[PDB]
Design a protein around this ligand. Structure first.
Ligand SMILES: CCCCCCCCCCCCC/C=C\[C@H](O)[C@H](N)CO
Ligand SMILES: CCCCCCCCCCCCC/C=C\[C@H](O)[C@H](N)CO
Ligand SMILES: [Cl-]
Ligand SMILES: [Cl-]
Ligand SMILES: [K+]
Ligand SMILES: [K+]
Ligand SMILES: [K+]
Ligand SMILES: [K+]
Ligand SMILES: [K+]
Ligand code: NA
Lengths: 245, 58, 242, 297, 242, 99, 58, 49, 49, 48
């Protein structure tokens, strides 16, 4: 009754029989922008069911040596479905998200993933190693799209900050002996009421193994991690031609 | 007094007692903040709350 | 003019003085403040959020740093073996430096309150076991065996469907507040020690791994407060920042 | 008007932020209540499930037998203004006689407080911050000596002409605010409002300021937030002839009327560059101290 | 005397400080103020008055400067031809510098609001035509054809007894205010683009000129406000004024 | 041709949402714009020289010698106001001497 | 207070809140102006006004 | 500014002057005072012993 | 010109006239000239006792 | 990735052995005749 769950939005339904409750980021559900917080004067478009629905975007393989990955929002979805089209045809965008990370193994496998959402996840570089070069991360690294990107130095989250404190952010753990998914609801987080879905990623999703995957030889060795997410309360404004960058 | 509402905290759910001698409120002292806290926002943001006595995962 | 007389302190610039200064932009109005999720009002709100405690603060090579976040348990061949130990002092160099509590602690000279460490077992569902986690108040030296550890404040943890257990380190001090403890006379302010022992044994059936890890999460209780704002011991820059 | 049932029973447009939690007054630390022994099945406060994402809800009273403690310890010093309303160094400007830097009696400093680590680490604990500020200007020679010199400080917002000489026409300062002060006077000090076009300043901006291809040549703009770019602070010695004295201006900032949102992990690697989180990849250090074994102190 | 203590800021002369100063002429009374027409109370009153927008800001020789005030239309031989284009940014170098709005804009760092450009056709009464005037919000590059321009905010203008048409450039921004946009990172604050296309064609009978001009008049709407008073980018003097 | 500005608004040209605008108009009042001190005069009292070499100078009051200030006031034809005058004196290097 | 009416704005349709320590009112601070505006004086000074919906020249 | 005029005594530091000085730690709260036996209120209490 | 800084136990003590600790972002500091009157401040009761 | 864009259920194996996929009535006409290759494919329901 805390372990079983069904999430239905749009024409999509997710089920899980080994859940660990649901986290509502910063204790606040997503909502549409009020007439007093808004500034842009055109009437927005709110497509509803055709964009607020679950999209399964990618699968990674968890290996005994995996470092961890990250995805950026709304970047992961800007080229997918009717949501993508709207994000491309409109200058302004805003929405919340329901994130459902999936990973099942067996009662004989073990390991624990930390699944967290970090708003304004700015990536740093190793500065030429010596720390004397002011190098910058390239586009494919700051906005990896649906493929996500692998962390080079998980301990400092590729940004000079301790992953040990990442739990100060909305998160759940997928500890194999306990659950097989993480569900996080994130409201729209920004210092502006609407923004560009292309130029700005409001938050990053981090999936990092903290207790490494293990099992005895002979047990299924391919343990996937699949990412499914749904935009909530999407609004778009400032219509013109479609743009991808 | 009869100043402008220039302060960065105008419309804050917490009220302050400041001092000022200028027409702009942002010139005011920091003053005192009210002592309200909401740790659950960060420490317990679960959809369905669980009590202390029960087993969290039932 | 009205008769006045200047007093000492005149012309000084005290950095913590809460005064009034002439505004540079008359009649200026700020951009309104829209609703933004996650507003914090007090640092104590952050001290109650659990962050990872690096009990295993031994490996230092860059490729093994992640190993600091978890420590192991495995089938022991016997009885009452020591698993791990650490000081409970939150503002002292060591395991707690990895926690947000530890870090925020660095900006205050004194603190008071109870702490709590929650241990999550991450072995397979088929693995069982019972551990004895003990807190030794000031004056008691590191317990040599489980029999002396058991005399202090403790929890006997049973692995099971609930993956975790909480060890509360209750505020047991002579003074109302403690300053940060360190070797020397300030050890007067030490909180004490935490030691983890095997109560029975880590047991597993054929087919499940023989080693598993525990992740520790630490934070403060609601009676925790801090006082006397100060600069943190670390300054994260070598030369000028460019 | 709306006749189809689905339009009528729609929640499209709900602008009310439904909050699961609420702030309560808490001026002192929580008290401790008397507790006794409990030998009961079913009830188990010590057992948790950290996977859920919440912190433990177990208290002292349910884990050991406690006495009653009436706690009067104040929580006032950990409010954001208590923590931040303390002036720290955020800028340093050199006006030397002979030199490579600002050798002509004037200097333009782009306002950026990320050049000094103590202050930078504190503000970066949060993602968004909104506040007013008090700026204090301490000027003297490089030995800390006070000499009879007149200076002019001018705030140059984006788009206003930046002076390019000690005699620039821009120093007429007919609209920009300027402060004329002597080194012999106490430090100049003024109040500054919250000036961003945004509702808050943000120490982290995961994006680009403009549209287009993001070719490696223009990657120096990743994370550049014009909303935090408040302009230039310009200083000059007031004269058509060069000053007889080498000068240094130290800039201190004290935040007040502070609001912050979204806490984040605190910096654990040395800072290398202003407004960018690059760290030395060859010297990644553990957050804190180490020891030789997990079973000894 | 009464005990006082001087604080930092003492003796400074802040040019925007709104203080009290000793009057030089005691009991002096000013000449009364008679009624004078045209009193202005707020600069925003002037921002709402339309002034000529120099869309045709290309000729620079002194004898051709007047040509900057109007741009042409003429019989096209075909379809959907581009007539003119310009950025909608009011405080950016370009066409808007000719407007009073543009100039007043120069004394403020930030602005917010909708703008409007009214186009007056000045061809003969016998000339007809339909034009498509489009406003492209941020992110959309200069439309290559009328078919992509038509996807943004637009007005299809029909020549007739009413000589003019108004294109409103609605406030469509991510931030509540915009600072002046310029090449580089501040392009973050760009308003977008305006492009004028032939919807059908400029048509005229035998005996009427084949070329005619359009005059553009620009101003702000009532939701327009400005903040953070600053000095204008230009200083109109070279040496000392004699 | 009538001589008036357009009366067309956002609402009648495109479909608009409701926006409650709290943006202040206070900074564009005449005092906000003009009550900022700017340089309007400069007087030299040199030791050796062609100009004011004898320890005194007479300056006819005219604020049109400096462009920043002059351009702002000339936005209007008639102006009535009180004024605060500040006098900053020093040597040509900006040094303060006991005079 | 009990000063002279020396200010340049005595008799202005807009009222101010100023500060002063002298007997002459022109010594006072600039204060705050009321926020009234009449743009029609410049933007729409026509004898017979025309509405937004109609055709201006009928 | 409000017209004032400095009087003799200005800037002097009289060691017995009972004045007000800027507090170094804003919003700081002292450790509470528990009951301690033997509090003295006046030196005259000791002169009688 | 002098700088006085209060360094509570655990705060970094400066080890040179140029120590980074003088940034004094949290510790209280007083900047005063020898020519000014004596600097003066109020200090609370600070013991853990 | 293209299948996921239609109506779907993500099924998790567990104590409840089964899952139900509802194929909702999504048709242009009020009724469908039996679909077959050719013009009557006009009446096809779609794919699972
Ligand atoms: C007459 C002297 C006036 C001096 C005016 C100082 C204005 C300072 C405004 C406060 C700005 C806060 C810092 C904002 C942004 C950060 O420094 C960086 N840009 C972040 O990348
Ligand atoms: C003891 C020092 C007193 C200084 C007295 C200054 C009085 C200044 C009166 C303000 C006059 C405003 C400017 C008037 C006219 C213009 O400068 C030009 N004549 C316009 O052609
Ligand atoms: Cl400690
Ligand atoms: Cl602009
Ligand atoms: K006198
Ligand atoms: K209490
Ligand atoms: K004065
Ligand atoms: K309004
Ligand atoms: K006296
Ligand atoms: Na429990």
């Amino acid at each position: 009754s805390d372990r079983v769950a069904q999430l239905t939005i749009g024409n999509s339904t997710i089920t899980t029989q080994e859940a660990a409750n649901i986290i509502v980021g910063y204790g606040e559900w997503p909502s549409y922008c009020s007439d007093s917080d808004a500034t842009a004067v055109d009437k927005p478009t709110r497509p509803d069911v055709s964009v607020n629905r679950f999209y399964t975007l990618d699968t990674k393989l968890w290996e005994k040596s995996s470092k961890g990955w990250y995805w950026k929002f709304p970047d992961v979805l800007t080229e997918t479905g009717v949501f993508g089209q709207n994000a491309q045809f409109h200058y302004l965008y805003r929405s919340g998200f329901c994130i459902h990370v999936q990973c099942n193994a067996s009662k004989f496998h073990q390991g624990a993933l930390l699944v967290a959402v970090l708003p304004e996840y700015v990536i740093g570089t190793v500065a030429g190693g010596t720390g004397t070069e002011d190098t910058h991360p390239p586009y494919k690294q700051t906005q990896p799209g649906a493929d996500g990107f692998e962390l080079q130095h998980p301990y400092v989250l590729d940004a000079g900050i301790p992953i040990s404190q990442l739990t100060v952010c909305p998160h759940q753990w997928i500890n194999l002996r306990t659950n097989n998914c993480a569900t996080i609801i994130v409201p729209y987080i920004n210092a502006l009421p609407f923004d560009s879905a292309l130029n700005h990623c409001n938050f990053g999703l981090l999936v990092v193994p903290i207790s490494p995957l293990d099992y005895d030889q002979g047990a299924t060795p391919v343990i996937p991690i699949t990412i499914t997410l749904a935009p909530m309360c999407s609004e778009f404004a400032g219509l013109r031609q479609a743009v991808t960058q | 007094s009869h100043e402008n509402s220039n302060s960065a905290t105008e419309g804050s759910t917490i009220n302050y007692t400041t001092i000022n001698y200028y027409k702009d409120s942002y010139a005011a002292t920091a003053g005192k903040q009210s002592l309200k806290q909401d740790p659950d926002k960060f420490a317990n943001p679960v959809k369905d709350i669980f009590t202390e006595m029960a087993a969290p995962l039932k | 003019g009205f008769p006045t007389e200047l007093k000492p302190g005149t012309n000084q610039f005290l950095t913590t003085d809460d005064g009034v200064s002439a505004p540079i932009l008359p009649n200026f109005h700020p951009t309104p403040c829209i609703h933004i999720p996650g507003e914090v009002r007090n640092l104590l709100e952050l001290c109650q959020v659990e962050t990872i405690l690096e009990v295993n603060n031994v490996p230092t090579n860059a490729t093994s740093l992640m190993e600091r976040l978890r420590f192991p348990v495995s089938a022991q061949a016997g009885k009452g073996e020591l698993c791990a130990v650490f000081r409970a002092d939150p503002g002292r160099n060591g395991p707690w430096q990895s926690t947000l509590l530890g870090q925020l602690c660095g900006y205050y000279t004194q603190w008071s309150g109870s702490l709590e460490v929650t241990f999550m077992f991450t072995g397979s569902f088929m693995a069982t076991g019972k551990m004895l986690i003990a807190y030794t108040p000031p004056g008691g030296p590191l317990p040599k065996d489980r029999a002396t550890a058991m005399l202090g404040t403790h929890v006997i943890w049973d692995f099971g469907l609930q993956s975790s257990v909480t060890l509360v380190i209750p505020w047991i001090s002579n003074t109302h507040y403690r300053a940060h403890a360190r070797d020397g006379v300030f050890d007067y302010y030490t909180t004490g020690l935490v030691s983890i022992w095997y109560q029975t044994n880590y047991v597993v059936p054929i087919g499940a791994p023989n080693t598993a890890y525990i992740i520790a999460l630490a934070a403060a209780q609601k009676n925790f407060t801090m006082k006397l704002c100060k600069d943190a011991s670390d300054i994260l820059q070598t030369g000028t920042i460019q | 008007g709306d006749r189809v049932a689905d339009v009528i029973e729609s929640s499209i447009g709900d602008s009310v932020s439904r909050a699961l939690t609420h702030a309560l007054p808490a001026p002192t630390g929580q008290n401790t209540q008397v507790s006794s022994h409990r030998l009961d099945t079913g009830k188990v406060p010590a057992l948790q499930a950290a996977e859920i994402g919440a912190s433990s809800n177990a208290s002292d009273e349910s884990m050991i037998e406690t006495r009653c403690v009436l706690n009067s310890h104040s929580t006032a010093e950990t409010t954001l203004d208590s923590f931040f309303s303390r002036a720290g160094l955020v800028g340093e400007i050199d006006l030397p006689l002979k030199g490579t830097t600002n050798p002509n009696g004037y200097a333009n400093w782009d306002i950026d407080i990320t050049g000094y680590a103590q202050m930078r680490r504190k503000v970066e604990l949060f993602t968004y911050m909104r506040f007013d500020a008090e700026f204090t200007f301490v000027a003297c020679t490089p030995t800390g000596e006070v000499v009879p010199q007149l200076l002019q400080y001018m705030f140059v917002p984006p788009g206003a002409p930046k002076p390019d000489s000690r005699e620039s026409l821009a120093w007429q300062t007919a609209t920009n605010p300027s402060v004329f002060v002597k080194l012999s006077d106490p430090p100049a000090q003024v109040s500054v409002p919250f000036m961003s076009p945004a509702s808050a300043y943000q120490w982290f901006y995961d994006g680009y300021p403009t549209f287009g291809e993001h070719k490696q040549e223009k990657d120096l703009e990743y994370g550049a937030m014009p909303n935090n770019m408040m302009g230039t602070f310009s200083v000059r010695t007031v004269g058509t002839s060069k000053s007889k004295y080498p000068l240094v201006v130290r800039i201190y900032m004290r935040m007040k009327h502070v609001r912050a949102w979204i806490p984040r992990p605190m910096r654990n690697q040395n800072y290398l560059f202003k407004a960018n989180p690059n760290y030395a990849g060859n010297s990644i250090k553990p957050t804190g101290a180490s020891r030789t074994a997990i079973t000894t102190l």
